[PDB]
Amino acid sequence: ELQEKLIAVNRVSKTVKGGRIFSFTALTVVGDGNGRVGFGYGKAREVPAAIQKAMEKARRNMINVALNNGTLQHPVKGVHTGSRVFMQPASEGTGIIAGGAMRAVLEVAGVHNVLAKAYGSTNPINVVRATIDGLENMNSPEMVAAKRGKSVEEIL
Amino acid sequence: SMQDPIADMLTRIRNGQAANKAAVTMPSSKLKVAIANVLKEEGFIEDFKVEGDTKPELELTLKYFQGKAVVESIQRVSRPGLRIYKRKDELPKVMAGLGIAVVSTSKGVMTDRAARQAGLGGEIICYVA
Amino acid sequence: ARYLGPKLKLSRREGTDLFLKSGVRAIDTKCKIEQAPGQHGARKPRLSDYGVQLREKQKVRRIYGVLERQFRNYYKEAARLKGNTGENLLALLEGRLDNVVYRMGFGATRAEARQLVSHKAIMVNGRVVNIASYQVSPNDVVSIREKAKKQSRVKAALELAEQREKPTWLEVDAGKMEGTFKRKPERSDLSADINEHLIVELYSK
Amino acid sequence: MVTIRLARHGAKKRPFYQVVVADSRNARNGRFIERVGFFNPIASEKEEGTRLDLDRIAHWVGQGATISDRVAALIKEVNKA
Amino acid sequence: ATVNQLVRKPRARKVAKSNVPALEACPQKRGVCTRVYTTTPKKPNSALRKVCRVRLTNGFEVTSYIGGEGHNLQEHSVILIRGGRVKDLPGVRYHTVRGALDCSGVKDRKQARSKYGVKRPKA
Amino acid sequence: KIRTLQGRVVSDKMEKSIVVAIERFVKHPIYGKFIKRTTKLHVHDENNECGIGDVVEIRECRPLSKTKSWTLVRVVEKA
RNA sequence: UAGCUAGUAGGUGGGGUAACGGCUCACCUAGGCGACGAUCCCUAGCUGGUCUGAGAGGAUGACCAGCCACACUGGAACUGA
RNA sequence: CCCGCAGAAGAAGCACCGGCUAACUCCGUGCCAGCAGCCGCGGUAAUACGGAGGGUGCAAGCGUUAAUCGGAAUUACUGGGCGUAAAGCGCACGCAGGCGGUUUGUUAAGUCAGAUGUGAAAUCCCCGGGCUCAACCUGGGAACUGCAUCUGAUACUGGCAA
Numbered sequence A: 001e002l003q004e005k006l007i008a009v010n011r012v013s014k015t016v017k018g019g020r021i022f023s024f025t026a027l028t029v030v031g032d033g034n035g036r037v038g039f040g041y042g043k044a045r046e047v048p049a050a051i052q053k054a055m056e057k058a059r060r061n062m063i064n065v066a067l068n069n070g071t072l073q074h075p076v077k078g079v080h081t082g083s084r085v086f087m088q089p090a091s092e093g094t095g096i097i098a099g100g101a102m103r104a105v106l107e108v109a110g111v112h113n114v115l116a117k118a119y120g121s122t123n124p125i126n127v128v129r130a131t132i133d134g135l136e137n138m139n140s141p142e143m144v145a146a147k148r149g150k151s152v153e154e155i156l
Numbered sequence B: 001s002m003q004d005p006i007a008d009m010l011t012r013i014r015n016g017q018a019a020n021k022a023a024v025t026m027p028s029s030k031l032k033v034a035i036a037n038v039l040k041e042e043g044f045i046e047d048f049k050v051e052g053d054t055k056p057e058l059e060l061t062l063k064y065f066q067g068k069a070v071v072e073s074i075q076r077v078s079r080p081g082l083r084i085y086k087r088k089d090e091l092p093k094v095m096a097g098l099g100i101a102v103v104s105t106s107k108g109v110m111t112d113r114a115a116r117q118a119g120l121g122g123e124i125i126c127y128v129a
Numbered sequence C: 001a002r003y004l005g006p007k008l009k010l011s012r013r014e015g016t017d018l019f020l021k022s023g024v025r026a027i028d029t030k031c032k033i034e035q036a037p038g039q040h041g042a043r044k045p046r047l048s049d050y051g052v053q054l055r056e057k058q059k060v061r062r063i064y065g066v067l068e069r070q071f072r073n074y075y076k077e078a079a080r081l082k083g084n085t086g087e088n089l090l091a092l093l094e095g096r097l098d099n100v101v102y103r104m105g106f107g108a109t110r111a112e113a114r115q116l117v118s119h120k121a122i123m124v125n126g127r128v129v130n131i132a133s134y135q136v137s138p139n140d141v142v143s144i145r146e147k148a149k150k151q152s153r154v155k156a157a158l159e160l161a162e163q164r165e166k167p168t169w170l171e172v173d174a175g176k177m178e179g180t181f182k183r184k185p186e187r188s189d190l191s192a193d194i195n196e197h198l199i200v201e202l203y204s205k
Numbered sequence D: 001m002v003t004i005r006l007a008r009h010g011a012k013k014r015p016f017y018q019v020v021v022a023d024s025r026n027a028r029n030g031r032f033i034e035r036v037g038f039f040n041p042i043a044s045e046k047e048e049g050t051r052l053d054l055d056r057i058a059h060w061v062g063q064g065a066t067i068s069d070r071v072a073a074l075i076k077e078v079n080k081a
Numbered sequence E: 001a002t003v004n005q006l007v008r009k010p011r012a013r014k015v016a017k018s019n020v021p022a023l024e025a026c027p028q029k030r031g032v033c034t035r036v037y038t039t040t041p042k043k044p045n046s047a048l049r050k051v052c053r054v055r056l057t058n059g060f061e062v063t064s065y066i067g068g069e070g071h072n073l074q075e076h077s078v079i080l081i082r083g084g085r086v087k088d089l090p091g092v093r094y095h096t097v098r099g100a101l102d103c104s105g106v107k108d109r110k111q112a113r114s115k116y117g118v119k120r121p122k123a
Numbered sequence F: 001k002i003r004t005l006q007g008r009v010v011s012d013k014m015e016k017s018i019v020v021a022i023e024r025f026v027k028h029p030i031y032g033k034f035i036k037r038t039t040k041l042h043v044h045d046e047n048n049e050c051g052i053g054d055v056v057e058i059r060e061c062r063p064l065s066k067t068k069s070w071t072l073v074r075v076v077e078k079a
Numbered sequence G: 001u002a003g004c005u006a007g008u009a010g011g012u013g014g015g016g017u018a019a020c021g022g023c024u025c026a027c028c029u030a031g032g033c034g035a036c037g038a039u040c041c042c043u044a045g046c047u048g049g050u051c052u053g054a055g056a057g058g059a060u061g062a063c064c065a066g067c068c069a070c071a072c073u074g075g076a077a078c079u080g081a
Numbered sequence H: 001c002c003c004g005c006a007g008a009a010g011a012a013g014c015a016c017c018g019g020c021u022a023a024c025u026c027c028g029u030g031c032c033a034g035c036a037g038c039c040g041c042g043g044u045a046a047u048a049c050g051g052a053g054g055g056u057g058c059a060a061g062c063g064u065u066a067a068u069c070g071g072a073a074u075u076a077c078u079g080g081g082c083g084u085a086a087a088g089c090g091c092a093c094g095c096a097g098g099c100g101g102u103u104u105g106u107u108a109a110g111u112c113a114g115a116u117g118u119g120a121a122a123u124c125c126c127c128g129g130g131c132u133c134a135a136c137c138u139g140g141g142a143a144c145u146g147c148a149u150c151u152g153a154u155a156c157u158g159g160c161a162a
């Protein structure tokens, strides 16, 4: 019912008196295909357990995206750590033109046609967080008109 | 020294919206009054008033919707160090249309959509979104 | 210039039928469609996003018997054309004369229709065309030449076609053996398992 | 002398002449002054296989331009029609 | 930088050089094996890589790797070299095209014959 | 009206001639800034009256010397 | 590579060109150019365009077309519109 | 180009298969032979070397090399930075240069609009036409972001005067 997508499974490790303890991290995204997307990051000593933890966290943390006909509303910039992303609406048929983490985020969020570039670092976690920030700060004509106190036609 | 009062006005509004001040006060100008007219009439501020005949002080009332500020972004484009002039067919879009581009055209200060209506170009004073 | 290999291996790779055989019998008794070909067929393949896009492109290409250079020219033309690139690509692929012959039912499979086209057994608007990639426009009357109307291939092809779905944008006869190409088929009309935005993204890569 | 002649373009075996008013010294497909029409010798029927701009040609002849032989034949045929 | 600073001193490109300068922008060069020998590579690799000191027609004296399983290049052999360095070897920036002029093909290859100048064995 | 220019005299040492610096206002092709650029034209001056630093108005004409193709028309102001 | 320039910059007069012109000569002025890069040094035919690029740009100018330059090397003029 | 002939008849190879990157196992070798674009691989169980089967990509082509742009936001005008990663002159004064508070008036240089002239043809792009289709060749348009005038606006910058 909610579309799942595993992005990166990265093996980290901490050092202890005996030696090294190798654990695993899983990054996932959940989305219904219609503007409701969230991301989850989970650690466990084992990859399936990490994936399940990420799944639960992602399902518990979703945000609303004001999609427009399966594409974005206007050009947006998503900024987090060392990752900047730019996302631009595209006419239908364009498909999703983005990197790895951004592709996962948009495919599960339900965007069907978008152009996107990722400047700065391309670490999957920060890329995901920047993309989600950009989507959650993307406006829509209805609420833009509402906040400005005008009508949708009077805005466009 | 103060080498761009227009940028000063925009920065005052930006900082005021950030700090939740109800009104922001500043020195007045013809151009500042015109920009305030444009912003008010497209609903980015409530009201503005210029009080004083020797040192005219302009006061702009800022508006917040559900708690959040309305002027989410406001940028000075044609700055003194790099003036920007655009023709009626390269007038920019702000927020892909939702935003506005305050443009000084030959007939007064008036947004990009209105300039495209009246077939004018001019100096892109600022972007508002 | 033509994939002259075993056909059912392609269907086994893509996991689905591509109609590369006539359809007299179900392909399950002719190949293990569930199993990918080769020594390591039962292996469970974890595909990447590039894997997904690559296999999608191959599937549609193999269906129409198109090679990569020609299909890239199709994609470039579809992107150039106004509207949706994916549906434009599918429509350009459908416009191929061999595919039109197949749909109209003069060939049991697209390879059979291709050989009919290439052996000058097909006319368009009255003129003989032997170009397997000729683009059929609206209102054209794809026909069969008189010296080739007597081939049992065409008959068996027609009675095999009749038990499938009839392409709406076509009008075919079995007596005169003609067909009016009424309109360009729409992405909605074509089979919905083809997911062409994967091809679009792949060629945008 | 400024001459009105045919500059051959097209491809192999399929000529397509452009009627150009040019100095008689320049190369055939070289520098011209004005393009006044075209002529397709293998013109399929139904298609306008020959077009001349008779007002401009008359302008040049008045200015003193000489007319090539094939162009003269084309003008005769087009004004006959 | 500021726009005035850029006007006074515009952005500078990065010229770049060639990893294979002795080719002189030519895909291959004919050279003469002034020496044929073997050398040991950088650590951690260890083996006896086959190289030749070659005198190209443009006068450059260079060192060229020789791929394949055993060669037949004695000194004065006329070989054709191409670009593409060998990593574990210090400074060896070229290969010798197998099967070209004298650098005959590898004896008994079956895969990637075109990379080693081996004609197709009969079916 | 005839084409013309208006500039500032920088030298009158030449006999029956002046050198006029004409400043133009060109938008930089790359960076979009409006930069000052000044061209120096050797301007013919019959009678020889213009001084260093005056605004003079000039017109192109036939060549007159090696580097003098421009000539006065009127003096806009005295400085 | 920071100063370069002696017909050098300008004026007058004579000569010369199809034509204005230090184009050339005599004389008289001491100027002319240069940090908005003069002079020198190293590569280089230029353009329409071509390749790449989302674009801005970047690289290059094979074929085709416009312009220029050259014709074993260095110079000259003659006939000729 | 059209018709007739006879017969599947005369016509498939190249690279790759550890990750990037689509495609995997046996045997030989044993840090040797060798591979390699980078990370790297090879020391007696090698999906990384060589052979074989199987497979993948492309196809009368397939790879390697050379070269350019891209990716490279890695010279950042669009579009970067400078406390510690490379990067604020040791600090000042200051000419040229860059920028300039506020109101009225005037000018129309910048700026904007419109028009005219040019910005060769071809090439790119759009709508069509013709070679059985395509490559190709064409008709018409658009474009050639430009430049020069002329006529207007003159809000903002510039000049000028208060």
Ligand SMILES: [Mg+2]
Pocket: none
């Ligand atoms: Mg081919």
Ligand SMILES: [Mg+2]
Pocket: G044
């Ligand atoms: Mg040269």
Ligand SMILES: [Mg+2]
Pocket: none
């Ligand atoms: Mg770029």
Ligand SMILES: [Mg+2]
Pocket: G072
């Ligand atoms: Mg010679």
Ligand SMILES: [Mg+2]
Pocket: none
């Ligand atoms: Mg003579």
Ligand SMILES: [Mg+2]
Pocket: H021, H022
């Ligand atoms: Mg793989």
Ligand SMILES: [Mg+2]
Pocket: H045
């Ligand atoms: Mg073994």
Ligand SMILES: [Mg+2]
Pocket: H072
């Ligand atoms: Mg760049």
Ligand SMILES: [Mg+2]
Pocket: H080, H081
């Ligand atoms: Mg940086």
Ligand SMILES: [Mg+2]
Pocket: none
């Ligand atoms: Mg340090």
Ligand SMILES: [Mg+2]
Pocket: none
């Ligand atoms: Mg430091």
Ligand SMILES: [Mg+2]
Pocket: H088
């Ligand atoms: Mg300091």
Ligand SMILES: [Mg+2]
Pocket: none
């Ligand atoms: Mg001011």
Ligand SMILES: [Mg+2]
Pocket: none
């Ligand atoms: Mg043109």
Ligand SMILES: [Mg+2]
Pocket: none
């Ligand atoms: Mg003023």
